Design a protein around this ligand. Structure first.
Ligand SMILES: CC(C)(C)c1nc(-c2cccc(NS(=O)(=O)c3cc(F)ccc3F)c2F)c(-c2ccnc(CCS(C)(=O)=O)n2)s1
Length: 270
């Protein structure tokens, strides 16, 4: 059984998630769409996550976008992805700002923790709209469908994609997703945090709550070691976070595309 501090911790996380996660993406509107030496590495960076895009209209109409082969056609999806990222990041920032453990930290550590974890919280939220049968992220009227590559194996060669399939296969509850979000957010070892002991104590408590929730609610033999599998996924997710930071920075060096909010989050000055 969870203690009262633990049940309350979960309720506060769950409430923050309910208030700040637009699961139907109803408020993502007026976003950009693809028009009607270092460069070899940028080519490698871009052609590794090909998605077609689908856009269903309230009236029943469907728009469908198929991406181009690398033959600057590589950049055609970046403004849209920047708008989607920005929308998600806003959701993430709101999430952090309504959690009491987060509001109570000094404002500089708030900033440092948000810059450390925005990508990871974004991937965690996206996993809950990921469909592993069809290979697609179902974001309300938007859909992002993985392109036929190689097969599912070759898709699993990409770390973001292997992470999404492997995280989906664990069939987490909402509680577990939200606790994963808090553990990743309260990482005491992000560049520029000052209250590292406070943040470490909070993280330890989130982790223990999660282990206890699993121990109380998931007895079936398939859930043995579930807690440790989740912590290994968070470790993997930090690895992915760092690779993607460098990926983004390279692309940004060649082809400016980041929004003001992304510039802030990734430490770009102007
Ligand atoms: C599920 C789905 C399909 C919606 C995706 N989500 C993400 C995702 C997840 C978390 C954060 C960000 N944002 S981000 O960290 O700022 C960022 C980093 C970066 F390296 C490049 C652009 C960025 F915006 C994301 F974009 C995707 C992603 C990841 C990496 N690269 C690309 C380009 C794909 S493309 C143009 O088709 O080649 N897209 S795909």
């Amino acid at each position: 059984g969870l203690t009262e501090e633990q049940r309350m911790m979960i309720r506060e996380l769950m409430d923050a998630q309910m208030k700040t996660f637009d699961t139907t993406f109803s408020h993502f509107k007026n976003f950009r769409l693809p028009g009607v030496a270092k460069w070899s590495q940028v080519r490698k960076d871009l052609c590794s996550l090909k998605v077609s895009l689908q856009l269903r209209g309230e009236d029943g109409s469907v728009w469908n976008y198929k991406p181009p082969a690398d033959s600057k056609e590589i950049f055609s999806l970046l403004p849209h992805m920047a708008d989607m990222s920005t929308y998600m990041f806003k959701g993430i920032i709101s999430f952090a700002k309504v959690i009491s453990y987060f509001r109570d930290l000094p404002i500089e550590d708030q900033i440092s923790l948000l810059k450390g974890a925005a990508f990871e919280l974004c991937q965690l939220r996206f996993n809950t709209v990921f469909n592993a049968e069809t290979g697609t992220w179902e974001c309300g009227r938007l859909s992002y469908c993985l392109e036929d590559t190689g097969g599912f194996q070759q898709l699993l060669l990409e770390p973001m994609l292997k992470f999404h399939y492997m995280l989906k296969k664990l069939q987490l509850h909402e509680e577990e997703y939200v606790l994963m979000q808090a553990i990743s957010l309260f990482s005491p070892d992000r560049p520029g945090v000052l209250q590292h002991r406070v943040v470490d104590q909070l993280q330890e408590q989130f982790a223990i709550t999660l282990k206890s929730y699993i121990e109380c609610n998931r007895p079936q033999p398939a859930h043995r070691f579930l807690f440790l599998k989740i912590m290994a996924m968070l470790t993997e997710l930090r690895s992915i976070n760092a690779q993607h930071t460098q990926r983004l920075l390279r692309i940004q060096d060649i082809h400016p595309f980041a929004t003001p909010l992304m510039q802030e989050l990734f430490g770009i000055t102007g």
